[PDB]
Each structure stands twice: as C-alpha cells, then as structure tokens.
Design a protein around this ligand. Structure first.
Ligand code: TZ4
Ligand code: TZ4
Ligand code: NAG
Ligand code: NAG
Lengths: 534, 531
C-alpha cells in the first residue's frame, strides 16, 4: 500500500501524487493534472472545455507535455537559452496543471500562489526548473499551483468575430485553471478565498489581463506582476492587426472567402508547420514583438488595456509590481545588428540609430529621432559603451519599465495598494555575459528559492537573499503586505503612491527606499511619445 | 592746460578730463563725435563720417543718449533705473568715449571696445556700469565705448530701399570701430590689437561684426557675454522687418517705400517709441521690435547659415552666460511673476508662461518644453515651476544659442574660451529668487567693486580684480590665462569633443564639461525638427 498522504480526490477523480525532497524536508507534488479536454483536432483555436471526469487513480507524479511552440536555436548547448526551452514532449495535448503542497498537507487552509509563466505568448512551460514549487511549499508552507496554457497560434491566433477562432484562448486556458483551483484546491489544504496570481513577462501581462477582465476577478484576491504589464506595446494587438496576421499566416501555409473555411484549413495543418511560419507575420523588423498575443476582442478585453487602467475602479486590489535592472539587454542579441553574447557588443552611433528603429518599430522618423536625442550622452555621443547601454535601456524602458511605471501610477491613483521594486542582483551562476547585467527573467530563480538547493552552487548570501524574497512574496500572498508585522527594525517597504512614488531596491543589501521610477525618462515614453504619434 | 589732456585726432583737437580712479588718475575723452548727427533727412540712414571742426572740442562730459524707451515698470527702483538713460535723450547721439591711463601709455596698448546691450531698443555708453575708469587704471587698457542708434531709429528697415536699408545701428558701431583704427594711436591705443566686447544685444552685435566681412579688418578678438548673433531674438527676416515697419507706419498715420519713409521722417521721435511695442507678432518676452535684419548685405545670410559654414581659423573668442539668464525677464509679461513677492506659480501658469517664453512654439512644441522642464517627482511644486520657467527663458534665448555658437566656432577653427558666471552681487536690488540675472556680471568685469564707496565686499573686490585680469589677458593675447602665474587651475579652451568651460565665482576656477548639453540638444537639434 501507498503513502496515505499522496492520495487525493478532485472533481475530477482520484489523483496519486509524489513525495518530493526539498532541502529542509519533504513536499507533496501533484503533477500533470488535466484541467481541460485536450484542445486537439476540431478543437484547435477553440476555447478550452472543462476536463471530463476519469475513472481510477490518475497518476500525477510527472510533468506533462509542453504546449506546441518554437524551440530556441540561437545558442546550442548554452544554459542561458536552454533553461527556457521545453523540458517535456511538445504536444497540442498540453492542458495540465501542477500542485505543490507541504508534506504532510496543512491542517488549516493555506494561501495559494498561482504561477503564470512568460515567453512572449509564444513559448513557456510550467515544468521548467526555475518554476519548481518545492521550495516555497517546503519553506513557506505555501500551496503553489502552475498551469500550461496554449501559446503562439494555438493560443492566440484570432479571426475576431468568428466562432471558430475568437482569440485569447490561451488566456481562457489560464482562466479555466483558476476555476479549477476554486473548486478543487481545498482538497489539497489550500484556501480558495486567498489566491494570489503571480507571473513574469507575458505571465505578468496575463496576470494584468485577469485584473482587467471581469469574469476572472472572482477567481483571485491579489496579484504580482514581474517585468510585464497588460498595457504597453507588445502585450496586445488590435482586432484588425490580429485578423491581418492570421490571414497572412493562413496564406503562408496554403490556406486561402469566409472565416469558417480559412480556420478549417488551418486546423488540417500540422502543428510544426504553424510554428515554422509564426514569425513571418510581424509587420516590421523588430525585437520584443511577438506574433500571436492577446487581442482586444471587446469580450475578454472590453477595451484596450490603456483605457481600462485609466478608467477602472481598483479599490479592493493589492498588487506587487517591479522590474529587473536590465530588462532590455538580452533582447538585443535577437535581432539588433552589432550585438552578441560572445563579445562586449560595443556599437557605433550608426548601429545605435538602426537599433532604435528595430527596438521601437512603431515609430516614425520624428519619433525615433526623439528617442535617439533623449538617450544620447551629448558629452560622449560616440562612446560605444554608452551606446551599447543606451540601446539596452531604450528596449528595457519602452517595453517594461515605463509600462510598469504607468501601471503602478494608474492603479495607485485609482484605489489600489501597490508595492513596487527594482531587482538588482545578478546571479553568480548567470551564463549571459557581464554586459547584460541583470537580464529579463533572472529574478525568478530567487523568488522560487532555487539558491536553497546546495547542489546549484549559489553563494551563502544568495541563499539568505532568496529566503528574504520568498518571505516578501508569501507575506504579500498572505496579508496584502510584503512587510513582516513582527519584525519592527528591518527597513519597511512603503506602498507606491502618486505623491511620493516610493519603490525598493532588491539586492544583497537591506531594503533601500527610492523615489520615482525612472520618472523623467518614463514621462517621455508615457506622456510625450504618444503625442508625436498623432 | 594739461598737455596729457589735449589730443589731435583726424577731425581736430579734443580736451579731456582727468578723472579719479581709486589707484590713481586716468584721462577720459567723453562725447567725441564720430558721425554727422543722424537727424532730419538722415533718420534711418547709414551714418556719415563726422566733418572736421575748428579750435578745441570740449570732450569732458558724456553726450546725449540715443532716443529710446524709458523703463516704467518699477519707477525709482535701482534695479531698473540703472539701465535707464542717465543723460538727455536726443536723436543727435553718435558719440564715443575713450579712457586711457594717465600719463598716456608709453608704448601701444591693447584696445577694448565696449558695445552695450538693451535688446537693440535701449542702452547707452554713459551708464555707471560701463565706466572704463578702472580697466584703464589697473590694467593699463585703452577702453572705448560708442553710442549707437536703437529701436526704430537704429533698426527700422524697409529692405532693399535706399532710405531705410536696415542695420544702420550696426553701421554706427562699424563707423566707431573705423574711428578707432584711424585715431586710437593718438591716445596710445594699438589699432592692431582691438578686442570687441559686449553683453546681451551688445554681444549679438559683436557676433554680427564677426559674421560681416567689412567689420573683420577692424578688430582681432571678441567677447560675447550673455548674447549671440544666432538664436531666436537677435535677427529678423527681411519679410518680417518690412511688415513691422509698414505696421508702425500705419500706426502713426503714414503714408511705395520712399513716400512711407518720408512721412515717418516727419514724425517726432516720441511718436515712434510710443507705438514701437505694438508691432510684435505675439504676446512675448525676450523679443524686440526692431533688431538687425537679414539683409543679404551687412548679413549675407542668416547668422545660423553663417556660423555653420564660416571659416574662423585666425579668431579668438571668449563667450559665456550668467547663472540665471531668464529670471529677470519673467516680470515683463508672464502672469504670476513680480519682483515684490516670491513668484510661486501654479502648473497652469507654467504652461501659459511657456507660450509666452517661446512665442513661436506650436501646441506640440510647447508640450515638449513643458514635459522636458517638469520635475516628474514634484510636478506641482511652485518653487520648481518658477525656477523652470526662468530656465526655459534663459536656455532658449541665451544659454543654448551660446552653446551652439561656441561649438560651431570651435569646430571651424576658432580658439574658444567659455564661462558661466555664478556670483550674485551683494548689492543687488532684485529679489533672491532671480539669482544672478541677465546683466549682473558687467559690474564686475568693469571693476566697480574697486570703488570703496559702492559698498561691495572685500571678496567682491578681489574677484573683480581676477575678472579684469582674464578679460585684459584675453585682450592682450587671445588667452585669458595669466602667463606669469605658474600655478593652476588653467582655463582650458572650449572644444567640441571635451566641451570645457569654467565657473566664475568667489571660489577658484572650476573646470566643468558640457554646457547644459542634454538640454541644449533639445533646443538646438530637436525643437527645430518639430517645426
Ligand atoms: N531565422 C529564424 C526563424 C524563425 C524564428 C527566428 C529566427 C527567431 C529569431 C531568432 C534569433 C534572432 C532573431 C530572431 N525567432 C525569435 C526568438 C526571439 C524572441 C526573444 C527571446 C527572448 C530573450 N528574452 C530575454 C532573456 N531571458 C529569456 C529568454 C527566453 N525566454 C524567457 C522567458 C521568460 C523570461 C525570460 C526569458 C528565451 C530565449 C532566451 C532568453 N526573452 N525572450 C522566432 C520566434 C518565433 N516565435 C518563431 C520563429 C522564430
Ligand atoms: N504697456 C507698455 C507700453 C509700452 C512698452 C511696454 C509696456 C513694455 C513692457 C513693460 C512691462 C511689461 C511688459 C511690457 N516694453 C518692454 C520693455 C521690457 C523688455 C526687457 C526688460 C529686460 C529685463 N532684462 C534683464 C535684467 N537686466 C537688464 C534690464 C534692462 N536692460 C538691460 C540691458 C542690458 C543688460 C541687462 C538689462 C532694462 C529693464 C530691466 C532690466 N533685460 N531687459 C516696451 C518696450 C519698448 N521697446 C517699447 C515700448 C514698451
Ligand atoms: C560581436 O559579434 C557580432 C557577430 O558575431 C558582430 O556583428 C559584432 O561586430 C561584434 N562586436 C564587436 C565589438 O566586435
Ligand atoms: C557546482 O560545483 C561543483 C564543484 O564542486 C561541480 O562539480 C558542479 O558541476 C557544479 N554544479 C553546477 C550546476 O554548475
């Protein structure tokens, strides 16, 4: 007979989980629990349907398939890229979620943290090493949930107004997993009335979209957005632009005239064919743009995220938001001429002006000259190191820092309690070059508590640092406040407000309170640049 | 009869006056005619050289101030009255002044020629702050200053006409320069070492002589203080001068060009000054009605075209700005601002003040300005908005045009030295929030603190001595550095690569790099692209 602590029933049917080892002791894991009917065949591009009950004991001891997606090839064998690549078989049959709980399971209901991965809505998996829930579960006593959701065409290809491809199905997958937690998480000792969404990059943008979409609001109570927002230039597309891209992809794969016929033809296409042409539909040469993303349908998103944050009422809402020191750096090697991970990437002024057009593709001649003039150091306008770093900052500011600044300000102006951070610590184990600093994605391993595994080779200080961070995030999940109530002396993390614009540095040093989140530069992007795009 | 006070110039004999300077005597020759009075039919015309005279011409007093507007915003207040005419007003005002050491220098001495400011609508070489006494006495310099015609009389133009060709006020200055070439040797001045210096409009004038071929054989070096020939206020197009002239003429009941000018010539001087202000195209500050015109003659092209393409290889230039170029202008039109209170303005008042500080700015352009100068951490702080409104006006009109001139001259072979003047005169009567306003360095360059009776601090006296040394070292050699003092900190030339300039204040020279580089990139490269 089996460990009595690993047998659990959901709506659902019977699950068998696995006792996993964490540094401080054991955790329970239920991996690869199906939450939808496999979205395959006639069902590609369609909203997810709830999983039908099964008979017997479903084995929930291993991660399940990763959703069909582009696999990164730019640097073969390189940990810097491979750590984000799929670590299970690619299949369209990928709608599974994972649960980590303390072992034995908690006696009284426990706060639930739901992770939503990033990958620009074209990639990602809940099964990646950096999303391992065992540490938060073992150390903080948290119930941690993560779901696979369809990406790329499978998740976001839309012919807006159609029945067969309405768009945003990837978000609907996420919503279904959240409904699943509501009905079922109490079986694992989680408290459905205390659910905090967190996510990074497109996951952050996803979390933000759940805040902005009414049918999702009853499904969670708090939200954390790491290095991503639902507003900004990459996280959504207009209905018209989504139609354009789906139509073009359709022709690239020999699918010519109503929507039914088109979509039917797309459905007969092999999954890999779609991935192989996914990238060809982008309107300009660009970086930090992705082909198939959330669409402003007038349904899931009733209006543009910009409009919904300017007019929304956010009184009952608590959000932790923030950014890493170098959001843009690692994007630069994916299409700006002159940039590489294998050299120092010192660029010329010409390579900088060309970079700007690629980093801000939307983005008239006048508008680009404004960006260049703003980011030039007029004391040393030809210095290749400053040019390199400005190119990085341009991409980081435009896509993450300033959309986050805008979000924090709007939410705080409209009733929300907002906490804001900038994460500035570079993992000792990073394999990206030094010049990239603290790239997009490299706080995640610290929030999840990876440094606690002695076999990963983080420094002792990093181990203590990760413990601090896990404490902030889960204090926030519990109470809506990252601070410790008992711990008087430790420096306080004040709320971000419009008046004082306070946020904290997260690094090896104790908390330092800073004011204004690149306030001057973000006034350029948020306030000015729109106006010379009229 | 003191033989030291008796000089023969080309047009006849002069008698000067021995004046007292704190260190000892100087010889002054004041009110020397350098032109036929520009009166009657000669109004608006180029100056003619003064006819020779009999006997000994009395040159012991300042002569009339050129006909001009007299300031009436704060009547009897030192801060304004000090720029007002201190002699009788007359159209008969083409005279100049020479201060020389006493006894007259043994060997040929460098000559400094002062060209006053006042927006081309006012000014006079007779003001207390332009007193050449001290430079003559302490440094052994021969100092010259001329009156030149201002407002309508100096710069009313109907371009391409014979009778009002424009720029005659600048021709007045050129004639005084010629007079120096012909006559200064008689005083012990070296006509081969002439340095022009000027402030505000006087600085813009200096720059116009730099950019006009016929003036170039009349001087060797130049100092432009808080003013430039390029930039938004110092010139107007032919088309715009014609419109203002026509408008003025219509405003005074006048009347082809000949006829219109003839009628203008019948009008009493005060009638022209009465309506001078109503020809401006917009509610504005730091804009002046009658200023030099791009005539294709004196100025062959815009100062902007001319500085971009000129050869400046055998030229040495000293340029600079004061710490608060625009503070004092704000009380002359921007709602919210007065000298009698702290002028703590609202945001609304800031956006409205920008439309006035940058009158030529579109809605979008003005937005860019506001967004640039707002402090986004304290977007509604009255003190910040007040200081920023000042900054807008100072950067737009003075600092950034100075930065553009400096870079252009340096790139094109000139030797350039730059400064920022940061000492507020203890005796200043303007309020504290104005900081170091436009015009308040001249005092120190001319050496007034050396007069014990004016109540400057000891520090202030020593500081003015330093400054007089930089200016005269510069006049003497084209280099402001003291060639005897074998200690630092050296004043380095301004260059396009390094962009070095120095702070002039009570502390020793500090070398700084980049003269508001980020901000001036905004004004010099970006803002034009919006238009
Ligand atoms: N010749 C081709 C053909 C097809 C595709 C190609 C190129 C590219 C491409 C590759 C290299 C250079 C330019 C373009 N691309 C583009 C891939 C570039 C996308 C950006 C990679 C990136 C870089 N960063 C910042 C650093 N950290 C991360 C990553 C990655 N993922 C994550 C996910 C979450 C958080 C962080 C993180 C993945 C890769 C490396 C770093 N995030 N994402 C395609 C994309 C498709 N969806 C489909 C097909 C193709
Ligand atoms: N209602 C009227 C009618 C006619 C005129 C009026 C107003 C004005 C005016 C006065 C107050 C507010 C708005 C408008 N104005 C405007 C004169 C004010 C313009 C500039 C004042 C100024 C302020 N600063 C800075 C501080 N230092 C100086 C000065 C002044 N001159 C100089 C000269 C050289 C160096 C410095 C300097 C003179 C004034 C005060 C300070 N420089 N110049 C007129 C002008 C004309 N040419 C003819 C008519 C009129
Ligand atoms: C770095 O390498 C890339 C491609 O291999 C190249 O384009 C770039 O010129 C290199 N940069 C430097 C500074 O050598
Ligand atoms: C950590 O360091 C050890 C050497 O003690 C080495 O054997 C191992 O490969 C390293 N682990 C990782 C994940 O880099």
């Amino acid at each position: 007979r089996e460990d009595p602590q690993l047998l659990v029933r959901v709506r659902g049917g019977q699950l068998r989980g696995i006792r996993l080892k964490a540094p401080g002791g054991p955790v329970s894991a239920f991996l690869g629990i199906p939450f939808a009917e496999p979205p395959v065949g006639s069902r590609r591009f369609m909203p997810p349907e709830p999983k039908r009950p099964w008979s017997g004991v479903l084995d929930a001891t291993t991660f399940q398939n990763v959703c069909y997606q582009y696999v990164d090839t730019l640097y073969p064998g390189f940990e810097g890229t491979e750590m984000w690549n799929p670590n299970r078989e690619l299949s369209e049959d990928c709608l599974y979620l994972n649960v980590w709980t303390p072992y034995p399971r908690p006696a009284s209901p426990t706060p639930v943290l739901i992770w939503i991965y990033g990958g620009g809505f074209y990639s990602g998996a809940a099964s990646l090493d950096v999303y391992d829930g065992r540490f938060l579960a073992q150390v903080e006593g948290a119930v941690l949930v993560s779901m696979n959701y369809r990406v790329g065409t499978f998740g976001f290809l839309a012919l807006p107004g159609s029945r067969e491809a309405p768009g945003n199905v990837g978000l609907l997958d996420q919503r279904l997993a959240l409904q699943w937690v509501q009905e079922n998480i109490a079986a694992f000792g989680g408290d459905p009335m205390s659910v905090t969404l967190f996510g990074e990059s497109a996951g952050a943008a996803s979390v933000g979209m759940h805040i902005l979409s009414l049918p999702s609001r009853s499904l969670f109570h708090r939200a954390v957005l790491q290095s991503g927002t639902p507003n900004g230039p990459w996280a959504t597309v207009s209905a018209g632009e989504a139609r354009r891209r789906a139509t073009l992809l359709a022709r690239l794969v020999g699918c010519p005239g109503n929507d039914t016929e088109l979509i039917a033809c797309l459905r007969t296409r092999p999954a890999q064919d779609l991935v192989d042409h996914e990238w060809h539909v982008l309107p300009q040469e660009s970086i930090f743009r992705f082909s198939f993303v959330p669409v402003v349908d007038g349904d899931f998103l009733s209006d543009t995220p910009e409009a919904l944050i300017n007019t929304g009422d956010f009184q009952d809402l608590q959000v932790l938001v923030g950014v890493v020191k170098d959001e843009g750096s690692a994007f630069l090697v994916y299409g700006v001429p002159g940039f590489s991970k294998d050299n120092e990437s010192l660029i010329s002024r010409a390579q900088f002006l060309a970079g700007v057009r690629i980093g801000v593709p939307q983005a008239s001649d006048l508008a680009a000259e404004a960006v260049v003039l703003h980011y030039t150091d007029w004391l040393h306008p030809e210095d290749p190191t400053h040019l390199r770093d400005a190119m990085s900052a341009v991409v980081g500011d435009h896509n993450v820092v300033c959309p986050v600044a805008q979000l924090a300000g709007r939410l705080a102006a409209q009733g929300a309690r907002v906490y804001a951070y900038i994460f500035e610590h570079r993992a000792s184990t990073l394999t990206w070059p030094l010049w990239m600093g603290v790239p997009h994605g490299y706080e995640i391993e610290f929030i999840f508590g990876l440094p606690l595994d002695p076999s990963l080779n983080y420094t002792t200080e990093e181990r203590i640092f990760a413990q601090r961070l896990m404490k902030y995030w889960t204090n926030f999940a519990r109470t809506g406040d990252p601070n410790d109530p008992r711990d008087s002396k430790s420096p306080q993390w004040p709320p971000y407000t419009t008046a004082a614009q306070q946020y904290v540095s997260l690094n090896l040093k104790p908390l330092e309170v800073r004011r204004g989140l690149r306030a001057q530069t973000c006034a350029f992007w948020n306030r000015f640049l729109p106006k010379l795009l009229s």
